[PDB]
Amino acid sequence: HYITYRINNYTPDMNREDVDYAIRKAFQVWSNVTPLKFSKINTGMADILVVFARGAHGDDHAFDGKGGILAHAFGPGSGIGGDAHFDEDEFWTTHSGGTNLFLTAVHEIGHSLGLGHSSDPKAVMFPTYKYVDINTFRLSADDIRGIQSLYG
């Protein structure tokens, strides 16, 4: 049972190979905590679809870039497999600012990929993005199962 994993739209910030390994971490933490796998697959949409909406009303009138909601809603099932849009009302800023580097992708995508809300204080379980040094990057209990076998 193998699953496809990819990240559409490469954020033009650093080296493709450099960021590639970084952005991969986000999907990794969510992968190792879920019954699936990530392999090299061509761009043809499968399981996860990285969707974005900025500037011009993507698809239809709506505007996601600062004019809707912080992070995407809906989880794995019905509302698309799992689309996580980044850079809309936060932008890539200092680790101690709006968007805490690609790290935010972990929690961000958590909404689309899974839906382990929990809302537990004194941890990242909360619905809000919790800062975390890339060095000490890691997920605590609960969240590990909050996505494992979601809508299956």
Q: Could you give the CA distance from residue 19 to residue 27 in angstroms, rounded to a whole number?
A: 13
Is the Cβ–Cβ distance between 116 and 122 less than 8 Å?
A: no
Instruction: Show which residues are catalytic.
Output: 108
The answer to whether residues 142 and 118 touch, using CB atoms and an 8 Å cutoff, is: yes
* Cα–Cα distance, 58 to 94 (Å, whole number): 27
Question: Please, is 114 exposed, middle or buried when counting C-beta atoms within 10 Å of its C-beta (0-12, 13-18, 19+)?
Answer: buried
Query: Do residues 38 and 49 lie in contact, with contact meaning Cβ atoms separated by under 8 Å?
Result: no
Torsion region of 12: left, alpha or beta (phi above 0 gives left; psi -120 to 50 gives alpha)? beta
The method recorded for this entry reads NMR
Ligand-binding annotation for 60, yes or no, is no
Amino acid in the structure at residue 115:
L
CA 113 to chain centre: 7
95 is in an annotated binding site: no
The residue ranges of every structural domain in the chain are 1-152
Q: What is the CATH number of domain 1-152?
A: 3.40.390.10
Contact residues for 72 (Cβ-Cβ < 8 A; gap 6+) = 83, 84, 85, 108, 111, 112
Confirm or deny that 120 is annotated as ligand binding: no
